[PDB]
A and B are shown apart, each in its own frame.
Chain A
Amino acid sequence: HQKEVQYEILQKTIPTFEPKESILKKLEDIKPEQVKKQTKLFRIFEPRQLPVYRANGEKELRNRWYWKLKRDTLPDGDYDVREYFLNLYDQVLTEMPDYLLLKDMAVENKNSRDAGKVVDSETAAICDAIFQDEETEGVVRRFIAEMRQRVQADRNVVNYPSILHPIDHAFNEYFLQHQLVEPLNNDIIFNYIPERIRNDVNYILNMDRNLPSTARYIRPNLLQDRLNLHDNFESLWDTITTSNYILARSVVPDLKELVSTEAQIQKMSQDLQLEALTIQSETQFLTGINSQAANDCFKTLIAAMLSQRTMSLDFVTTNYMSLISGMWLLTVVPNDMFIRESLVACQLAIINTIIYPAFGMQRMHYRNGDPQTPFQIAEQQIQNFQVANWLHFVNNNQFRQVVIDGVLNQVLNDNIRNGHVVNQLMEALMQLSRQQFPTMPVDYKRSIQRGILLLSNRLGQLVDLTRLLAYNYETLMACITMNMQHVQTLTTEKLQLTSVTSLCMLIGNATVIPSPQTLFHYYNVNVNFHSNYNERINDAVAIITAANRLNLYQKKMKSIVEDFLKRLQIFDISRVPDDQMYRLRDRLRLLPVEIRRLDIFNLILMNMEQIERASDKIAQGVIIAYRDMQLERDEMYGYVNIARNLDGFQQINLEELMRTGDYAQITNMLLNNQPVALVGALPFITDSSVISLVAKLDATVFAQIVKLRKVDTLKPILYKINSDSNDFYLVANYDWVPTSTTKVYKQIPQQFDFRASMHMLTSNLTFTVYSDLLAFVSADTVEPINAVAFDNMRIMNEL
């Protein structure tokens, strides 16, 4: 009960999904980055006809074209406007196309006299409206009627006329000029295959497909970890190695043609003579010896090495057959793949039950925390060359590090790869079978020596097994794309030494290597995970940097980090400790923004002011000038109390006033009628009544600021006086200058200009994007009887 409680306390801090096996599905459902195609030109603005007024305020007989926001949804308050533009940034990033083919958006120009086409249908509508307009210049009309697309199929190029606002043109031009599709040919596919698989003669790779020159693909982003999750993220790294271990388990091949369990079990029982002993556990000695355990051991060892997930050793000390098998396990598997306590426990059991008793040595009084393992002490304390040399190998058989194709790999000593070191193990244990065991009761000594010989007499099978294990490890490691970082993980995979015994006593001579399709699937899942990891890092970094550069100081980067972890697909975010979440935020802040996202953000940041000032529902401020200022004469309003700028007034930032809560300066200025300019995104009332201006109602709207100590209900009056006002005759039939004491800081819409809006958009005529590159490869394998290792000899040679 207690042990489960403490282990649950630990496991609640690890974001691994509790049914480990189900993680496989979550890893296999990660797809390549979704390819986005543009169906229409990106537009924030549209042309619109608006009424205009003469200087006297009379509505003219013609409308004028102006650029307006297609969706005018801007909020009030500067902070909320910046939030709006962060949301716009996210929208652009999510809808950003990976490639464009303008011909899909090419429609007919109704007024074309030369079979002309334009992109897109919105351009067609605008061009028709301009063509019909009576105020259009004859040269513009003739050009609309004559402007031509150019399709060059030989060059795979298209050019179309488009009408776009300059900001919309910038977005679409960036999309056209920075597409993610590269030319795809057989050389790129062939190089996509891992190099160590292209060089293994056990696999036959062919290219039986012709790619057209129009073939395209999107390169995966296989950048190595910029967050260094193997450093100081214990829970996250534990989850990463667990998920990798599950995947590697899925791809390790199943063993074939094992030794009959009945025969080997009877052989082991006859040799060990356990019934004739006095062991308190007679039945348990040979339990856990079967084909299922041997296959599980094979999978566990290869997958644990592939994922660099730490292993613990679970064994019964009295089971010396398990310890004899553990001798082989420590011979072939690097000692650093095990948790220190388990390695020390197994070595100390081997020393104090088998090896030191064999040589008559005093049992090792080992001390926990010793920089030397029990085997490192034994190597110095043992004089026999067979045992000392095998011990020396075990003491130094740690993973070697090597970078291949930019991927860090944990590789084995060559004596493991060719299986020669098993001979040394054999030598050592043959010596142990000849030893006297001075004080040992003879029946127990005979049993120990016969179990030693049970492992010893499988020398050929063990060499074959070591070579098979190493070859499978190397072939599967060729498919790894992220650096194999070695860290001692919080939790381990528990490996039974009885399963090691099953593998050692039951392996035959049937070679099993990964299937080419298994290798391609493993590599594809690794690539998809790596690419998704990089893309989610880039998305998180882009949003964090945008929020900071947009001065979104109430934004919680924790939600961003949680979304990033959730999109990585392998983390239960509820079990991520807070310190690691904050460390993740800190490391994400330090990374630079990816070029495409940063360019989109720069476009948005540079055009923010223009977009915000185009909105019809927010003004940029209000000047309270307690002097009488003449209403401006604007073509868009008639008479309007509009301020072009804020020159000549002290500015109170409304966002700062809202945040501080300190209304002393604003209250003092309003009480004393001190001229001021309140700056910030404000909703305004459009008042068309001359009587309202004569009543001076625009000066009546600020006192609620002092009453409530709020600024989120401030709605200044923007007068709009023209011939459409019901009381306009007062302006027309009397001698007086319409004035007000307040002005609204707002901008005037930009006029549509055909010359500044007409662009030629260029793209490719047509191509096909492909995603599954390895689907273009025909992949066969040799007969497993003929499979060879790195040394060109057969993986298994006992035949």
Chain B
Amino acid sequence: MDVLYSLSKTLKDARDKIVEGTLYSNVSDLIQQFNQMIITMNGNEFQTGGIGNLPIRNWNFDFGLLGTTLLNLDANYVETARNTIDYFVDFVDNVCMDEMVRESQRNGIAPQSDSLRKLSGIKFKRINFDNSS
């Protein structure tokens, strides 16, 4: 849950802050967090959605890191970031939907969908950051 929230929060920050012309100092910490997220998610396969009419979606992560060398963000930087962000937002939305449609009598607090169970592993805890909601 903390990892799913961290993914979503990183993506929201990236959508709101990785904008054309902005000082790299406005995004540096976010770029570090985003690159950490990419590194952690790279090489991992996820499957979401096999309950009801929720379609089966397969997710593969092989993305490049965002640059760190610019002084102000330009169109190229924003476009690369936007493509990666679009894929990640789609994945997070599907994982959230997959979790929202499942329930359990015994351990209903614990994750139910396979993707959130995979994201509960230690190899994803690095993604975790500011939990402010």
Residues of A within 8 A of B (CB): 544-545, 548-549, 551, 589-590, 592
Question: Is B32 interfacial (CB 8 A cutoff)?
Answer: yes
Verify B28–A548 contact, CB threshold 8 A: no
Query: Cβ of A545: which chain B residues have Cβ within 8 Å of it?
Result: 68-69
State in angstroms the CA–CA spacing of A545 and B31 once bound together. Answer: 15
Query: Cβ of A544: which chain B residues have Cβ within 8 Å of it?
Result: 69
Q: Which 9 A-B pairs have the closest CB atoms?
A: A548-B69, A549-B71, A590-B68, A589-B68, A592-B28, A589-B69, A592-B32, A590-B65, A590-B35
Most buried by A among B32, B35, B67, B71: B71
Distance of B73 from chain A, by nearest CB (Å): 12
Question: Is B70 interfacial (CB 8 A cutoff)?
Answer: yes
20 A-B contacts, Cβ less than 8 Å apart? A544-B69, A545-B68, A545-B69, A548-B69, A548-B70, A548-B71, A549-B24, A549-B69, A549-B70, A549-B71, A551-B71, A589-B67, A589-B68, A589-B69, A590-B35, A590-B65, A590-B68, A592-B28, A592-B32, A592-B68
State in angstroms the CA–CA spacing of A592 and B68 once bound together. Answer: 8
Query: Cβ of A549: which chain B residues have Cβ within 8 Å of it?
Result: 24, 69-71
State in angstroms the CA–CA spacing of A543 and B71 once bound together. Answer: 14
State in angstroms the CA–CA spacing of A590 and B32 once bound together. Answer: 8
Query: Cβ of A589: which chain B residues have Cβ within 8 Å of it?
Result: 67-69
State in angstroms the CA–CA spacing of A427 and B68 once bound together. Answer: 61
Distance of B123 from chain A, by nearest CB (Å): 15
Distance of B96 from chain A, by nearest CB (Å): 30
Not counting A548-B70, A592-B28, a sample of 18 additional A-B residue pairs whose C-beta atoms are within 8 angstroms of each other reads A544-B69, A545-B68, A545-B69, A548-B69, A548-B71, A549-B24, A549-B69, A549-B70, A549-B71, A551-B71, A589-B67, A589-B68, A589-B69, A590-B35, A590-B65, A590-B68, A592-B32, A592-B68
Query: Cβ of B24: which chain A residues have Cβ within 8 Å of it?
Result: 549
Query: Cβ of A551: which chain B residues have Cβ within 8 Å of it?
Result: 71
Query: Cβ of B35: which chain A residues have Cβ within 8 Å of it?
Result: 590
The residue of chain A having its C-beta at the shortest distance from the C-beta of B39 within the complex is A590
The A contact surface, by secondary structure, is helix
Distance of B26 from chain A, by nearest CB (Å): 13
Query: Cβ of B67: which chain A residues have Cβ within 8 Å of it?
Result: 589
Query: Cβ of A592: which chain B residues have Cβ within 8 Å of it?
Result: 28, 32, 68
State in angstroms the CA–CA spacing of A548 and B28 once bound together. Answer: 15
Residues of B within 8 A of A (CB): 24, 28, 32, 35, 65, 67-71
State in angstroms the CA–CA spacing of A612 and B35 once bound together. Answer: 36
State in angstroms the CA–CA spacing of A544 and B69 once bound together. Answer: 8
Query: Cβ of B32: which chain A residues have Cβ within 8 Å of it?
Result: 592
The residue of chain B having its C-beta at the shortest distance from the C-beta of A602 within the complex is B25
State in angstroms the CA–CA spacing of A549 and B69 once bound together. Answer: 6
State in angstroms the CA–CA spacing of A592 and B32 once bound together. Answer: 8
State in angstroms the CA–CA spacing of A255 and B24 once bound together. Answer: 59
The residue of chain A having its C-beta at the shortest distance from the C-beta of B24 within the complex is A549
State in angstroms the CA–CA spacing of A667 and B69 once bound together. Answer: 35
The residue of chain A having its C-beta at the shortest distance from the C-beta of B69 within the complex is A548
Query: Cβ of A548: which chain B residues have Cβ within 8 Å of it?
Result: 69-71
State in angstroms the CA–CA spacing of A599 and B71 once bound together. Answer: 14
Query: Cβ of B65: which chain A residues have Cβ within 8 Å of it?
Result: 590
State in angstroms the CA–CA spacing of A548 and B24 once bound together. Answer: 12
State in angstroms the CA–CA spacing of A548 and B67 once bound together. Answer: 11
State in angstroms the CA–CA spacing of A590 and B28 once bound together. Answer: 10
Query: Cβ of B70: which chain A residues have Cβ within 8 Å of it?
Result: 548-549
Distance of A250 from chain B, by nearest CB (Å): 38
Distance of A132 from chain B, by nearest CB (Å): 46
The residue of chain B having its C-beta at the shortest distance from the C-beta of A557 within the complex is B69
Distance of A357 from chain B, by nearest CB (Å): 46
Distance of A585 from chain B, by nearest CB (Å): 11
State in angstroms the CA–CA spacing of A57 and B28 once bound together. Answer: 53
Distance of A541 from chain B, by nearest CB (Å): 10
The residue of chain B having its C-beta at the shortest distance from the C-beta of A550 within the complex is B71
State in angstroms the CA–CA spacing of A589 and B69 once bound together. Answer: 7
State in angstroms the CA–CA spacing of A727 and B35 once bound together. Answer: 67
Query: Cβ of B69: which chain A residues have Cβ within 8 Å of it?
Result: 544-545, 548-549, 589
State in angstroms the CA–CA spacing of A545 and B68 once bound together. Answer: 8
State in angstroms the CA–CA spacing of A551 and B24 once bound together. Answer: 14
The residue of chain A having its C-beta at the shortest distance from the C-beta of B66 within the complex is A590
Query: Cβ of A590: which chain B residues have Cβ within 8 Å of it?
Result: 35, 65, 68
Most buried by A among B28, B35, B65, B69: B69
State in angstroms the CA–CA spacing of A549 and B35 once bound together. Answer: 20
State in angstroms the CA–CA spacing of A592 and B35 once bound together. Answer: 12
Distance of A165 from chain B, by nearest CB (Å): 25
Distance of A358 from chain B, by nearest CB (Å): 45
Query: Cβ of B28: which chain A residues have Cβ within 8 Å of it?
Result: 592
State in angstroms the CA–CA spacing of A544 and B28 once bound together. Answer: 15
Distance of A502 from chain B, by nearest CB (Å): 45
The residue of chain B having its C-beta at the shortest distance from the C-beta of A586 within the complex is B65
State in angstroms the CA–CA spacing of A544 and B68 once bound together. Answer: 11
Distance of B34 from chain A, by nearest CB (Å): 12
State in angstroms the CA–CA spacing of A548 and B71 once bound together. Answer: 8
Distance of B132 from chain A, by nearest CB (Å): 22
State in angstroms the CA–CA spacing of A108 and B71 once bound together. Answer: 45
The residue of chain A having its C-beta at the shortest distance from the C-beta of B29 within the complex is A592
State in angstroms the CA–CA spacing of A590 and B71 once bound together. Answer: 14
The residue of chain A having its C-beta at the shortest distance from the C-beta of B35 within the complex is A590
The residue of chain A having its C-beta at the shortest distance from the C-beta of B72 within the complex is A549
State in angstroms the CA–CA spacing of A548 and B68 once bound together. Answer: 9
Distance of B31 from chain A, by nearest CB (Å): 9
Distance of B47 from chain A, by nearest CB (Å): 29
Distance of B23 from chain A, by nearest CB (Å): 10
The residue of chain B having its C-beta at the shortest distance from the C-beta of A590 within the complex is B68
Distance of B115 from chain A, by nearest CB (Å): 27
Query: Cβ of B71: which chain A residues have Cβ within 8 Å of it?
Result: 548-549, 551
State in angstroms the CA–CA spacing of A549 and B32 once bound together. Answer: 17
State in angstroms the CA–CA spacing of A571 and B32 once bound together. Answer: 30
Distance of A531 from chain B, by nearest CB (Å): 23
State in angstroms the CA–CA spacing of A589 and B65 once bound together. Answer: 11
The residue of chain A having its C-beta at the shortest distance from the C-beta of B71 within the complex is A549
Distance of A607 from chain B, by nearest CB (Å): 15
The residue of chain B having its C-beta at the shortest distance from the C-beta of A605 within the complex is B71
State in angstroms the CA–CA spacing of A720 and B70 once bound together. Answer: 41
State in angstroms the CA–CA spacing of A544 and B35 once bound together. Answer: 19
Distance of B1 from chain A, by nearest CB (Å): 26
Query: Cβ of B68: which chain A residues have Cβ within 8 Å of it?
Result: 545, 589-590, 592
State in angstroms the CA–CA spacing of A552 and B68 once bound together. Answer: 15
